Amino acid sequence: HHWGYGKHNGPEHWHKDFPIAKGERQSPVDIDTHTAKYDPSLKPLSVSYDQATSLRILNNGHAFNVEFDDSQDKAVLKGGPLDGTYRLIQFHFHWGSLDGQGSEHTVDKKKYAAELHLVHWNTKYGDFGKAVQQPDGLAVLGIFLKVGSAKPGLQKVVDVLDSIKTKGKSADFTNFDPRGLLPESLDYWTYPGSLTTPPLLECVTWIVLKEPISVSSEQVLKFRKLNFNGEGEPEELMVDNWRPAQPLKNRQIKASFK
Numbered sequence: 001h002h003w004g005y006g007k008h009n010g011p012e013h014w015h016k017d018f019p020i021a022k023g024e025r026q027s028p029v030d031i032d033t034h035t036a037k038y039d040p041s042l043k044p045l046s047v048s049y050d051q052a053t054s055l056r057i058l059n060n061g062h063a064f065n066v067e068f069d070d071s072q073d074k075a076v077l078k079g080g081p082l083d084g085t086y087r088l089i090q091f092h093f094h095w096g097s098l099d100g101q102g103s104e105h106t107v108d109k110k111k112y113a114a115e116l117h118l119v120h121w122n123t124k125y126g127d128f129g130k131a132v133q134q135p136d137g138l139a140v141l142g143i144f145l146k147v148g149s150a151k152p153g154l155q156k157v158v159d160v161l162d163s164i165k166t167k168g169k170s171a172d173f174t175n176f177d178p179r180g181l182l183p184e185s186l187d188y189w190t191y192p193g194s195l196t197t198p199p200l201l202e203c204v205t206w207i208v209l210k211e212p213i214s215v216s217s218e219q220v221l222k223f224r225k226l227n228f229n230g231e232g233e234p235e236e237l238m239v240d241n242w243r244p245a246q247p248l249k250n251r252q253i254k255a256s257f258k
């Protein structure tokens with residue numbers, strides 16, 4: 001009886017095994033655009049992905065992770081609200097059964113079709129496992145997906161999904177360039193939060209881009225053909241793998257833009 005997103009093991013259950021589910025800095029949150037304060041002291045964000053080394057794509061039973069070589073400072077996030085250097089370790093998505101839901105963060109209560117998370121760890125803590133035990137251990141760049149025009153830079157991801165349909169399947173995924181998933185503008189909101197999946201550790205600086213990327217109906221339809229289940233098991237489509245908005249509590253969402 002493991003956690004997931006079903007009727008019986010979904011987000012409203014998670015607090016029984018992971019009591020920090022009801023903690024003081026949980027994610028995701030609703031971003032109230034009228035209440036977020038422009039912080040003129042925030043630096044521009046530095047996304048340095050030109051030497052990124054992608055390795056592999058894994059269906060882990062909840063999402064799929066595109067994993068990177070994080071054994072050196074190849075793909076890093078710096079600046080904005082961050083002190084020091086954060087190494088890219090993986091990216092994944094959360095998405096819906098239909099285009100009107102899927103994102104984890106919301107914007108004035110608006111749900112996007114999906115949400116990309118580029119996960120980075122603070123190199124002062126030496127490894128990811130140590131970083132997630134620190135309040136400043138991770139920085140997650142969040143990017144909304146809306147359905148409209150195809151995203152060309154996403155199609156190599158879409159075309160490998162058939163090969164990792166079920167939980168535990170992986171495929172080689174070298175030479176993928178994550179710059180192809182970014183919007184034009186790096187304008188962002190930032191707040192202190194958590195992992196949105198168990199163990200729901202309170203170790204994340206959230207940086208959520210204002211500008212969504214466009215993906216095609218066909219691209220997101222291929223996400224929705226993935227399975228939560230293992231090979232040979234009854235099919236459970238991998239949809240609605242999103243945690244809803246959590247109470248903001250004693251937190252301020254800051255804007256990088258006026």
Ligand SMILES: [O][B]1([O])O[C][C]C2=[C][C]=[C][C]=C21
Nearest residue numbers: 117118119140194195196197
């Ligand atoms: O959804 B989640 O918070 O977003 C990126 C950070 C991370 C890392 C491992 C598993 C899940 C997540």
Ligand SMILES: [Zn+2]
Nearest residue numbers: 092094117196
């Ligand atoms: Zn995520």
